[PDB]
Amino acid sequence: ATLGIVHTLMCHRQGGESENFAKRAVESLVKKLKDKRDELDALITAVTSNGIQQSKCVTIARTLDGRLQVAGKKGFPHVIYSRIWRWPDLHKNELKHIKLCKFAFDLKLDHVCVNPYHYERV
Amino acid sequence: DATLGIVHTLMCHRQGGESENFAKRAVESLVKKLKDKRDELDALITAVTSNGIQQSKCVTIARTLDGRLQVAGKKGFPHVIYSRIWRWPDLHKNELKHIKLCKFAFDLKLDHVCVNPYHYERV
DNA sequence: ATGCGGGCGCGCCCGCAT
DNA sequence: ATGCGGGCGCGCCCGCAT
Ligand SMILES: [Zn+2]
Ligand SMILES: [Zn+2]
Prior knowledge:
Two copies of one chain form a homodimer.
Chain A: H1 2-10, H2 19-32, H3 37-48, E1 59-61, E2 68-70, E3 73-75, H4 77-85, E4 95-97, E5 111-113, E6 119-121
Helix pairs in contact in A: 1-2
The first copy, chain A, binds a DNA duplex (18 and 18 nucleotides) through strand 2.
């Protein structure tokens, strides 16, 4: 059942990462939201409507140094998912969170919002 | 750094059953674990450089949850790894039996595991 | 009913970029 | 000299051989 969800999210990718990298990052996030139906629904809504339909934060636990590893490569979780679904050429320090983003990376909370439509490019 | 001399003398006694990178990494890892265990580092050097003729006490490392130790991306049992490096280059998984005086043998399922290759026998 | 195995990531740490 | 990104290991996870 998560295969359908993963595939649907994968079709909205921009191609800034390898197929293996994007698949692994999407599967990892979906698994983290397994018992967070509201946040999984928010991600699907945000991604499949290309941000037109409003959504709440999609959060994952923050690691000791803030970085997330996917297929042997480390990076910030909000940059990883914003690079997958919105800016394929995205670099570090090119993101500013929106006013309504309660769990932004900049806020240095226990959890980090990875909703790509909760960030803006600079 | 003084540990270079120790890693070299222990490398001389390698049998060639593993790659240079694997042997170097495994020996460096063990030496680092014995950093504040002078008696156990001395026991290992004594055992290895005398080819087991000079008696030695147990050379122990902390046991991991599943017993396995990872070296250069490859997992295996710590007592089999070091027994393969200095004694039996063709050594496989359940080919080892500890000696009577081995107090921390793998087989005893204790907190610490003896990796002294001269504290085991082949079957 | 276990225990391999092997994939994979966070935490630790080294050695390399600055 | 030394802070920091990238390599690597133990723990977790899970399928399958034993
Ligand atoms: Zn948000
Ligand atoms: Zn022993």
